[PDB]
UniProtKB/Swiss-Prot annotation:
It catalyses: N(6),N(6),N(6)-trimethyl-L-lysyl(9)-[histone H3] + 2 2-oxoglutarate + 2 O2 = N(6)-methyl-L-lysyl(9)-[histone H3] + 2 formaldehyde + 2 succinate + 2 CO2. GO terms for cellular component: blood microparticle; chromatin; nucleoplasm; nucleus; pericentric heterochromatin; site of double-strand break. It is found in: Nucleus. Binds 1 Fe(2+) ion per subunit. It comes from Homo sapiens (Human). The chain holds residues 11 to 341 of 523 of the full protein. Fe cation binds at H182, E184, H270. The gene is KDM4D. The lineage of its organism: Eukaryota, Metazoa, Chordata, Craniata, Vertebrata. It comes from the Eukaryota. This is Lysine-specific demethylase 4D. GO terms for molecular function: chromatin DNA binding; damaged DNA binding; histone demethylase activity; histone H3K9 demethylase activity; histone H3K9me2/H3K9me3 demethylase activity; metal ion binding.
Length: 331
């Protein structure tokens, strides 16, 4: 068995190996990469996503989200308070202001210590979930707006043609902006490219151990757990590495820098934070190996998780028993 300790693997494809996206994912899996739940891919030195980032300031962040925490430093939830629209230039200036800017620090480890000690006492503003792309149309390799669609993968594997579309999303971050513990919708893969700015630290639980994290979360968030049998789908709960270690939960961590891709694998729980002003692009995707995970994925039917148009068909075809209840949740 390849990668039996479920370590995060880092890959350095050549420009020739960067041509065929599906083939390289399958290669990484042949080496055991999926067992960690997360892999890093450093593009060949010849590649670029676009020529420059000098002209992005006029992108609108229609609904910036203020991430307000409740709980204790290592075990907390966040809610998203909607703020007035602002441009990416306005948001960058806000991220760099004395109130929001990254503090002085020694290295990534010191900054991580400071994040876990102090996150809850601040409410950073995240420009998350913005439909769009920063890849140049002429970038032919690993262009997240030109991937094969999940609807096409389902049709190729299973024969059934379904409605829906699959497009990327931009994330503009600042110091302490946070992504809560989650897997993807329908336990899909995700791919995330850090276009510019400061790093993003990730935490991940191996897919084979995801239920260990769920059982801890039910213990740590007992009211949420009674409200919903899949409340991590709400994407609100944070648990620190120290708390994970105290409770014996297997996990790994890694920091992504500008110019690097991360892939999350089906049922790989992940969480993390931004070091300072940055911009990432991410999209979900599927492979043949995903289908079985999609058929078994949990679902939120309490009404909180509320998701995309395209998830309807995935539930309807892969989980017809659950369909009726799930759709009541969505309506
Ligand atoms: O970057 C973020 O805030 C969150 N991203 C993801 O969860 C992902 O790419 O799967
Ligand atoms: Mg612009
Ligand atoms: Ni994710
Ligand atoms: Zn729910």
């Amino acid at each position: 068995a390849q990668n039996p300790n479920c370590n995060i693997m880092i890959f350095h494809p050549t420009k020739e190996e960067f041509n065929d996206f599906d083939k390289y994912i399958a290669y990484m899996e042949s080496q055991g990469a999926h067992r960690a739940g997360l892999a890093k891919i450093i593009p060949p030195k010849e590649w670029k996503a676009r020529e420059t980032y000098d002209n992005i300031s006029e992108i609108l962040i229609a609904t910036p989200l203020q991430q307000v925490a409740s709980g204790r430093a290592g075990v907390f939830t966040q809610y998203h308070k909607k703020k007035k629209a602002m441009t990416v230039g306005e948001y960058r200036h806000l991220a760099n202001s004395k109130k929001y800017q990254t503090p002085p620090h020694q290295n990534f480890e010191d900054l991580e210590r400071k994040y876990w000690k102090n996150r809850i006492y601040n409410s950073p503003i995240y420009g998350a979930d913005i439909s769009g792309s920063l890849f140049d149309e002429n970038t032919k390799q690993w262009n997240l707006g030109h991937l094969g669609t999940i609807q096409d993968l389902l049709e190729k594997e299973c024969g059934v043609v379904i409605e829906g579309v699959n497009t990327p999303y931009l994330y503009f971050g600042m110091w302490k902006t946070t992504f809560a513990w989650h897997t993807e919708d329908m336990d899909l893969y995700s791919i995330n490219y850090l276009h510019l700015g400061e790093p993003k630290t990730w935490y991940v639980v191996p897919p084979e151990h995801g239920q260990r994290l769920e059982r801890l979360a039910r213990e740590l968030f007992p009211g949420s757990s009674r409200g919903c049998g899949a409340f991590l789908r709400h994407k609100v709960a944070l648990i620190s590495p120290t708390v994970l270690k105290e409770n014996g939960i297997p996990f790994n961590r890694i920091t992504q820098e500008a110019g690097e891709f991360m892939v999350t694998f089906p049922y790989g729980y992940h969480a993390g934070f931004n070091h300072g002003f940055n911009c990432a692009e991410a999209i979900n995707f599927a492979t043949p190996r995903w289908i079985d995970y999609g058929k078994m994925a949990s679902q939120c039917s309490c009404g909180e998780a509320r998701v995309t148009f395209s998830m309807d068909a995935f539930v309807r075809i892969l989980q017809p028993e659950r369909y009726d209840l799930w759709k009541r949740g969505q309506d």
